[PDB]
Amino acid sequence: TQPYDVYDQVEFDVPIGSRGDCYDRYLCRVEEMRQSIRIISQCLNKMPPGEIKVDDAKVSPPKRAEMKTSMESLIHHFKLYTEGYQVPPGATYTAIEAPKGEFGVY
């Protein structure tokens, strides 16, 4: 329902039981494990070669070879610590499905 980082494109299988007993609540987790390799295999096949961090040095720190030569990179590397990111104000709530439940970070 709610994609995070490239979802719906990867084929997911969700195990859902019939009764709310401990045995069916155990079987779904084992069926999650048998239907987990499908996601891993599709992640192995679909890999675009490119960038690891964001190009913005305001958010993500630059490369080690990059900072040693150019000026702007090292200053942004220096300022991403002490007083780092500089976040835009406003309350936000995100939840990504944990294998146990949800991480409702606010």
Binding site: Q2, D56, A91, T92, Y93, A95, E102, G104, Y106
Partner: protein
């Protein structure tokens, strides 16, 4: 934008209709301030009646949230009124997230 923007707003217009729908009821008992930014909705509620607001969003035909899963509270001394209880709500049939606050 390739790496600059996270996501384009398309459902934001449909989510803005929710901010009008509850406001169309228009209670000074409930509504006050409606804020909506970044694919989400935030409502703050007058202290006198919180239970009638919680019965709403639950059960209702147009908006069937029901699950009031996460419950937070803010600690801030800037305002004349100190703490702020913040409810985080989720729908399973409707598939949407809404926020309830106290002042």
């Amino acid at each position: 934008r390739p790496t600059v923007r996270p996501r384009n707003d398309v459902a934001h217009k449909q989510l803005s209709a929710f901010g009008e729908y509850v406001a169309e009821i228009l209670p000074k008992y409930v509504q006050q301030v409606q804020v909506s930014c970044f694919n989400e909705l935030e409502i703050c509620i007058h202290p006198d009646g919180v239970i009638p607001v919680l019965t709403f969003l639950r059960d209702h035909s147009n908006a069937q949230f029901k699950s009031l899963a996460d419950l937070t509270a803010v600690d801030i001394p800037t305002r004349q009124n100190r703490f702020e209880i913040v409810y985080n709500l989720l729908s399973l049939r409707f598939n949407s997230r809404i926020r309830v606050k106290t002042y």
